Design a protein around this ligand. Structure first.
Ligand SMILES: CCCCCCCCCCCCCCCCCC(=O)OC[C@H](COP(=O)([O-])OCC(O)COP(=O)([O-])OC[C@@H](COC(=O)CCCCCCCCCCCCCCCCC)OC(=O)CCCCCCCCCCCCCCCCC)OC(=O)CCCCCCCCCCCCCCCCC
Ligand SMILES: CCCCCCCCCCCCCCCCCC(=O)OC[C@H](COP(=O)([O-])OCC[N+](C)(C)C)OC(=O)CCCCCCCCCCCCCCCCC
Ligand SMILES: CCCCCCCCCCCCCCCCCC(=O)OC[C@H](COP(=O)(O)OCCN)OC(=O)CCCCCCCCCCCCCCCCC
Ligand SMILES: CCCCCCCCCCCCCCCCCC(=O)OC[C@H](COP(=O)(O)OCCN)OC(=O)CCCCCCCCCCCCCCCCC
Ligand SMILES: CCCCCCCCCCCCCCCCCC(=O)OC[C@H](COP(=O)(O)OCCN)OC(=O)CCCCCCCCCCCCCCCCC
Ligand SMILES: CCCCCCCCCCCCCCCCCC(=O)OC[C@H](COP(=O)(O)OCCN)OC(=O)CCCCCCCCCCCCCCCCC
Ligand SMILES: C[C@H](CCC(=O)O)[C@H]1CC[C@H]2[C@@H]3[C@H](O)C[C@@H]4C[C@H](O)CC[C@]4(C)[C@H]3C[C@H](O)[C@]12C
Ligand SMILES: *C(=O)CCCCCCCCCCCCC
Lengths: 12, 124, 128, 165, 171, 127, 221, 122, 71, 88, 81
């Protein structure tokens, strides 16, 4: 079971 | 209740209980869980010193006065006994260990030109 | 019969052992009612802005501003030179400086005297 | 150093006799062991002190790993008062934890013996402070008392951990 | 404020925990578990507000004399060696709105379903304001308890952050 | 003592919403939508060569991966380190100093061939 | 020599390659922990070869490969002391650290920042080897303080736990007090002996050495 | 030990002082006394590079042992024969020290009886 | 953690074991006890005593060179 | 972290299983929504003992303020389930 | 994966140390209403756990067996030389 993990934006 | 008007520069800022933030109830839904504070609540003058990562004034199982006596008593007794044992060294019934060639005169960087005082060790 | 709890400035009195928590009259029960009334009004003000979806930014807490202001800006205008402050200022402000001066001054004079007499070991000292 | 080391081993070993947290107990074991190394330096046996360092890492490192195994299984539980009956529930962790304790206590011919047991002999037969000598000997007894404490409260008895683990 | 009964109930819970720490073994703990209960049960009938309270103060003061110096704490309870362990992995929900557009494209469904809540929040916000300001006394609330929704399609006032809090093991 | 009539409702409403929010957190089978990426041929080589168990040909991967690591992390650095020491460090005075080997009685010297005299006759006794 | 000296330095350099490679050269986020564990395994094996050389014949040497600075008559060089202690200790430290890293791959298996975790564990081993193989006081100080900070960065690993931060900053506090003696030892040797190399400290063999030794004892405490 | 009590809980002048021993001339009580010989010359110990604390009369058994280990590499279990020989040689030397300690005790005790005998009649 | 042979947790029951797990644990413990016994036989003096400790109270006055009280 | 999650079915099963072991509660009179006070006739002290058994079952403390408001097994299952983000 | 909970009726405090508590609590008229809750810790694989001295003796049966044979081989092998 895969759950979304909220993280700060990593693109920048 | 403001601070005493002694001129140290407190003004009319509130004097809150000298309780660390560690004591405050941890289960209450604080606005600032880490600080255990509430939005708008008057902050203790020494709030920065009473954060959970600093001075903690929670009650102790052993009275403060007794704890100092036990800690001071133990350390002082240990220091004295070490002093006692320093004057009464433990050792074995053995004479000075003997070494050859004038007690290793030339091995310890002794001056060759000044001939050492002869040292001779006899059989036993 | 138990050893009565002793409290210092770094060990508060347990709320369980506080007699003030048992002499509960209508006034004491009423006082706590007032506290929760003021504490409730502030909570509502904070929650209304906190949960607002059209709000973005920082909720400026007036309490935080007052705390910092008292710590830095409001100190001097409420300072009166009297016996307590004058001696505390001299004791802490000036006491350390005079103490260290004679500690170092005596030390260097003693060392200088030995050096001029050749009594101090500087056999390999060529780094200063 | 002889006096400083002796008080360290006596004090921290005495503190480990009553700690519940499994990690805390080994923490005081290290401090007690380090004082033993300091005393070794104080009696002018630097190589014995160095030898104890190399041998110490083996069984000391294993104990923390073995304790980590127990902690993980019980869902991050560290108090020994919520363990027990693990002698057959964790046979491999049980075996290593016993070996670590025996080596720590200085069982003959294990890793601890060739360094620890060779030091106390040197301590007794050297011109040394008498009170310092006693504290080390008393401390060595405590090494066995709290070494047993871990096994007794973690590997024996009836399980005290929650129902589902 | 705490009622007299609650304080006795609180003391009953605390004593057993400290008692359990001393006893360790279940059977030994189980034996004394009833003995302590016996001491509480007998004084149930005491109906004198002065005498009954005086018993409590001695009860509190005997516990403080006999408390365990190192009571067992559950790992995640305040003071246990897991408290606030995972607070570093808990990121607030609003951090997603700053994600780069190419970064959002990796989870088209999650963000598409996110707009439903954000749309739901904006729609319901104004109603939540009206519900509270009519049930609020003139001088403001006197307690921190909040009312629930009282219609169909309405959500409890001030629900967003209670609903959208980070999980206990977010990573 | 327990909940008031409304409290059992607000928790029920919040709990009903809370579970609904927690359900949304799950990901779809496609998510994450990984952007296309070019893989080297070797990755396709090992992916297909290793579909079967075939213990005998799997150990080659162990040898191969260790072989690659043993070259780019052990063999090459010592070439650089030895090259660095041999012609740049050893060429300067006292950069590398060796403790002279211990010479025992009754040994021959490689440089010269000198024979060190043996010690005198011990009063041997096997105890 | 050519083999004893080369294999001694390759052990230290082999450990720094996983750190250097973290600058996005080869991207293997999932198996990076295995990359670090494997690096130790080979690192331990290489260190065994010099150890055998010392055991067989007691071979020791210094390696002052680099000339960093020169303060007048004081010359600071990057020197490694391959001797009894360091040669015997590096295999033991690597052998133990090899087990811990293999253990850590399992214990921290669910940690989001396990890649960051295995970097710090590797940084500590690098600094510890600096301390053990240091031949002059200043180089010893670099690893002496280096290990100290890596302890702080790992004690406070769960930076959300207020007690983790309190303990992490507490180790720095006590260690800093100890370092006061370390600076005292460095100053006394420089003023009285005009050196920081352990070689010249022993050859001169100062007689009245209470002050430098007391400082060291404070640092070791 | 046990003689420690005799010195601290007892007279000290009738007890040896390890930091001042010996207190009598070596020739005393041993007419035409012999001496210990070094079977290994200084150049041999210097070349062998032995620690100064090992440059005792028991050397030349240590030197032989160190040679065995160097040659017998990698077989570290062997050379157990030389270890015991050097150990026993060390043990014999250690005992000879004990004789000096006990010789010191007897001679001092003799001086105690002598002083009484000569002083009482005075 | 993840990986390794998987075992289903049990409720209020003794956990499941494996042949490999239990066998390996026993072998090392047996290996420990053989090592102690074998070492003890060959190196008894290493724990009991190397060499006999002489008794000062049996040495003679003539080997110690103690002149008679008479002179 | 190697600990299987908790489902609503499992939690409720464990809650009733714990109570069924209680000697002062008759299993037949024990149901999902059997109020501890108004149906099973228990004093407040016995209510506390229930929670202590419950906490050791799930291995996590419940505050006294929130424990005193739990009077039936159904409410307890709600509190535990919400405290651990249990949804399915 | 529904977990098949063990039937709770099998949990009894008969023949275990919990009975000793029950007997003593009867001498004062008291009863233990949680005994069956803690009964599983004393029945099954958790029952009759080894004593501390037994733990230190683990593997001694096998260890000694491997030892006696080994010394014999050394005894004879060194006899030749
Ligand atoms: C060894 C020390 C190495 C330290 C290290 O690299 O860890 C960084 C590490 C980075 O922290 P992080 O948490 O992993 O970063 C996570 C980021 O969020 C995200 O990080 P990331 O994984 O996404 O990417 C890694 C990296 C990505 O970096 C890059 O992509 C480019 C980096 C380029 C740096 C070099 C450019 C300058 C060179 C230009 C001149 C070239 C001339 C060519 C001709 O980004 C960074 O770490 C931040 C940049 C830091 C640059 C400053 C350090 C280099 C200065 C030299 O630092 C620390 O964690 C704390 C310091 C740990 C060391 C403390 C103890 C030091 C003891 C002394 C060390 C030994 C001294 C020498 C010994 C002498 C005796 C032999
Ligand atoms: C000449 C020597 C150097 C002199 C300066 C150092 C002397 C000590 C003066 C500085 C101490 C205070 C540091 C600034 C405050 C930061 C630490 C702090 O606030 O305390 C929180 C922490 C409290 O940590 P804690 O582990 O005791 O408890 C934390 C609270 N609980 C457990 C409930 C979560 O204090 C410290 O860690 C440091 C205090 C000890 C240092 C002082 C003793 C020095 C050694 C004496 C011998
Ligand atoms: C190698 C060996 C190394 C050994 C190292 C360890 C040495 C340990 C030595 C033993 C230490 C024992 C501690 C003794 C100091 C105790 C000080 C003390 O107890 O007083 C602090 C004082 C508490 O009293 P207070 O709260 O003011 O009274 C009630 C007012 N409401 O509260 C105050 O702070 C008032 C100001 C006084 C502060 C104390 C003086 C400084
Ligand atoms: C030299 C130290 C002198 C200290 C003794 C003098 C202070 C004193 O005795 O107080 C006298 C007077 C207070 O009298 P009072 O009546 O209470 O206040 C006025 C009310 N109308 O005091 C006053 O009213 C005025 C204050 C006069 C003294 C101020 C100067 C004293 C030095 C202050 C500290 C300086 C710190 C400098 C820091 C150095 C660098 C760190
Ligand atoms: C008041 C400031 C002037 C002063 O008192 O300094 C005088 C002092 C020298 O005077 P004196 O010490 O009496 O003579 C013997 C010196 N070897 O000056 C000296 O040379 C000795 C150092 C003076 C220490 C006291 C300084 C007072 C604090 C600083 C001034 C604060 C205003
Ligand atoms: C005080 C002690 C502690 C001080 C430490 C301070 C922190 C420093 C951080 C660590 C720095 C790493 C030091 C090791 C790298 C040395 C760099 C170097 O090689 O410098 C060139 C060196 C010649 O330098 P040298 O003649 O000895 O005098 C230098 C005076 N500035 O050597 C050469 O001549 C270059 C020869 C290179 C041959 C190999 C090149 C092929 C390999 C390239 C790929 C790798
Ligand atoms: C050798 C080691 C494990 C081998 C094994 O299965 O036992 C494997 C595991 C992950 C590998 C590493 C990672 O794949 C990252 C790098 C990938 C490139 O092939 C260069 C080497 C590189 C640094 C690899 C070296 C080596 O092959 C590694 C370290
Ligand atoms: C003496 O040289 C060393 C100090 C003695 C330490 C050992 C103490 C134990 C001896 C007394 C008990 C003897 C009877 C078993």
């Amino acid at each position: 079971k895969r759950l979304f993990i909220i993280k700060p934006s990593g693109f920048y | 209740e403001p601070y005493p008007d002694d001129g140290t520069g407190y003004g009319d800022y509130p004097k809150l209980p000298d309780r660390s933030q560690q004591e405050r109830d941890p289960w209450y839904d604080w606005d600032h869980p880490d600080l255990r504070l509430n939005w708008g609540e008057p902050m203790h003058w020494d709030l920065d010193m009473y954060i959970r990562n600093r001075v903690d004034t929670s009650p102790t199982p052993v009275n403060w006065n007794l704890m100092c006596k036990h800690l001071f008593g133990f350390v002082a007794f240990m220091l004295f006994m070490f002093w006692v044992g320093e004057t009464y060294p433990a050792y074995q019934p053995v004479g000075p260990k003997q070494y050859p060639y004038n007690n290793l005169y030339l091995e310890r960087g002794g001056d060759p030109n000044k001939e050492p005082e002869p040292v001779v060790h006899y059989e036993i | 019969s138990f050893p009565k709890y002793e409290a210092s400035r770094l060990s508060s009195l347990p709320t369980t052992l506080d007699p003030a928590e048992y002499d509960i009259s209508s006034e004491t029960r009423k006082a706590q009612a007032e506290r929760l009334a003021i504490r409730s009004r502030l909570k509502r003000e904070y929650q209304l802005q906190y949960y607002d979806p059209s709000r973005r930014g920082v909720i400026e807490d007036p309490a935080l501003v007052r705390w910092t202001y008292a710590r830095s800006a409001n100190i001097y205008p409420n300072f009166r030179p009297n016996t307590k402050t004058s001696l505390l200022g001299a004791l802490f402000g000036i006491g350390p400086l005079v103490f260290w001066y004679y500690v170092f001054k005596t030390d260097r004079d003693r060392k200088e005297k030995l050096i001029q007499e050749g009594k101090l070991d500087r056999t390999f000292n060529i780094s200063y | 150093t002889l006096c400083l080391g002796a008080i360290t081993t006596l004090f921290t070993a005495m503190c480990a006799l009553t700690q519940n947290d499994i990690k805390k107990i080994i923490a005081f074991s290290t401090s007690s062991q380090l004082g033993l190394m300091m005393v070794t330096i104080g009696i002018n046996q630097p190589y014995l002190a160095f030898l104890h360092i190399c041998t110490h890492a083996f069984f000391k490192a294993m104990l923390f790993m073995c304790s980590g195994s127990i902690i993980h299984s019980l869902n991050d539980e560290q108090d020994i008062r919520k363990m027990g009956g693990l002698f057959k529930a964790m046979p491999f962790t049980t075996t290593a934890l016993i070996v670590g304790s025996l080596a720590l206590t200085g069982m003959p011919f294990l890793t601890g013996f060739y360094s620890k047991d060779l030091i106390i002999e040197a301590a007794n037969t050297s011109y040394t402070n008498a009170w310092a000598l006693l504290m080390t000997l008393i401390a060595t007894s405590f090494t066995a008392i709290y070494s047993t404490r871990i096994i007794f409260f973690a590997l024996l008895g009836q399980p005290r951990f929650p129902t589902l683990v | 404020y705490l009622t007299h009964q609650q304080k006795v109930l609180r003391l009953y819970k605390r004593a057993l925990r400290h008692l359990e720490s001393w006893c360790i073994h279940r059977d030994k703990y189980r034996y004394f578990a009833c003995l302590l209960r016996a001491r509480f049960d007998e004084h149930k009938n005491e109906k004198d507000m002065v005498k009954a309270t005086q018993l409590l103060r001695e009860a509190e003061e005997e516990f403080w004399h006999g408390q365990h110096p190192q009571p067992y704490i559950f790992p995640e309870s305040p003071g246990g060696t897991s408290y606030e362990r995972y607070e570093c992995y808990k990121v607030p929900e609003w951090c997603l709105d700053d994600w780069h557009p190419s970064e959002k494209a990796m989870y088209p469904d999650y963000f598409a379903k996110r707009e439903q809540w954000k749309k739901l929040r904006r729609e319901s916000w104004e109603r939540e304001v009206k519900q509270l300001q009519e049930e609020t006394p003139v001088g403001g609330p006197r307690t921190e308890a909040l009312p629930p929704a009282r219609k169909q399609g309405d959500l409890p006032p001030l629900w967003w952050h209670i609903v959208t809090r980070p999980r206990e093991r977010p990573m | 003592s327990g909940y008031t009539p409304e409290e059992k409702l607000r928790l029920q409403q919040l709990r009903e919403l809370r579970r609904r929010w927690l359900k949304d957190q799950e990901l779809s089978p496609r998510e994450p939508v990984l952007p296309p990426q070019r893989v080297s041929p070797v990755e396709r080589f090992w992916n297909k060569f290793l579909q079967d168990g075939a213990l005998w040909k799997n150990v080659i991967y162990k040898t191969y991966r260790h072989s690659i690591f043993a070259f780019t992390h052990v063999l090459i650095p010592v070439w650089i380190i030895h090259y660095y020491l041999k012609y740049h460090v050893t060429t300067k005075p006292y950069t590398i100093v060796e403790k002279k080997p211990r010479i025992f009685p009754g040994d021959t010297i490689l440089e010269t061939g000198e024979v060190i005299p043996p010690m005198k006759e011990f009063p041997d006794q096997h105890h | 020599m050519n083999m004893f000296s080369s294999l001694s330095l390759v052990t230290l350099l082999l450990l720094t390659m996983p750190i250097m490679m973290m600058s996005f050269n080869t991207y293997k986020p999932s198996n990076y922990p295995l990359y670090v564990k494997t690096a130790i395994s080979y690192a331990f094996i290489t260190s065994m070869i010099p150890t055998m050389m010392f055991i067989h014949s007691g071979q020791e040497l210094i390696i002052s490969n680099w000339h960093w600075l020169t303060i007048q008559t004081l010359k600071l060089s990057l020197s490694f002391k391959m001797d009894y202690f360091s040669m015997m200790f590096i295999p033991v430290a690597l052998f133990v650290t090899w087990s811990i890293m293999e253990f850590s791959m399992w214990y921290m298996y669910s940690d989001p920042n396990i890649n960051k975790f295995f970097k710090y564990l590797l940084l500590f081993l690098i600094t510890m080897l600096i301390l053990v193989t240091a031949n002059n006081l200043f180089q010893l100080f670099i690893g002496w303080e280096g290990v100290g900070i890596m302890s702080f960065l790992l004690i406070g690993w769960w930076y959300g736990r207020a007690d983790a931060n309190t303990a992490a900053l507490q180790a720095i506090l006590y260690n800093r007090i100890g370092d006061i003696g370390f600076i005292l030892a460095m100053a006394w040797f420089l003023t009285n002996l005009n050196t920081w190399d352990l070689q010249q400290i022993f050859m001169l063999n100062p007689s009245d050495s209470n002050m430098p030794l007391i400082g060291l004892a404070l640092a070791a405490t | 030990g046990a003689h420690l009590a005799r010195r601290y809980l007892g007279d000290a002048s009738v007890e040896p002082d390890p930091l001042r021993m010996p207190t009598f001339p070596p020739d005393y009580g041993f007419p035409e006394r012999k001496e210990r010989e070094m079977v290994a010359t200084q150049q041999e110990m210097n070349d062998a590079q032995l620690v100064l604390q090992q440059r005792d009369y028991c050397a030349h058994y240590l030197i032989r042992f160190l040679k065995c280990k160097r040659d017998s590499f990698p077989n570290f279990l062997a050379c157990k024969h030389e270890r015991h020989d050097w150990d026993y040689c060390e043990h014999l030397d250690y005992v000879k020290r004990m004789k000096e300690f006990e010789r010191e005790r007897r001679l001092l005790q003799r001086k105690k009886r002598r002083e009484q005998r000569e002083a009482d009649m005075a | 953690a993840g990986g390794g042979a998987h075992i289903e947790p049990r409720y209020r029951q003794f956990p499941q074991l494996t042949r490999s797990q239990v066998i390996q644990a026993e072998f090392f413990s047996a290996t420990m006890w053989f090592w102690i016994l074998w070492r003890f036989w060959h190196d008894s003096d290493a724990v009991l005593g190397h060499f006999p400790y002489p008794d000062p109270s049996q040495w003679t006055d003539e080997e110690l060179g103690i002149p008679p009280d008479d002179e | 972290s190697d600990a299987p999650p908790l489902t609503l079915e499992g939690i409720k099963d464990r809650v009733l299983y714990v109570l069924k072991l209680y000697d002062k509660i008759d299993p037949e009179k024990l149901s999902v929504n059997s109020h501890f006070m108004k149906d099973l006739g228990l004093d407040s002290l016995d209510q506390v003992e229930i929670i202590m058994a419950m906490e050791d079952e799930f291995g996590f403390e419940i505050p006294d303020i929130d424990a005193e408001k739990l009077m039936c097994p159904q409410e307890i299952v709600d509190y535990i389930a919400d405290k651990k983000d249990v949804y399915e | 994966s529904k977990m098949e909970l063990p039937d709770y009726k099998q949990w009894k405090i008969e023949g275990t140390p919990l009975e000793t508590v029950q007997e003593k609590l009867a001498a004062r008229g008291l009863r233990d209403p949680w005994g069956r809750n803690e009964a599983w810790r004393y029945m099954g694989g958790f029952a009759n756990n080894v004593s501390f001295v037994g733990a230190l003796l683990k593997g001694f049966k096998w260890g000694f067996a491997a030892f006696v044979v080994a010394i014999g081989a050394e005894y004879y092998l060194e006899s030749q030389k």
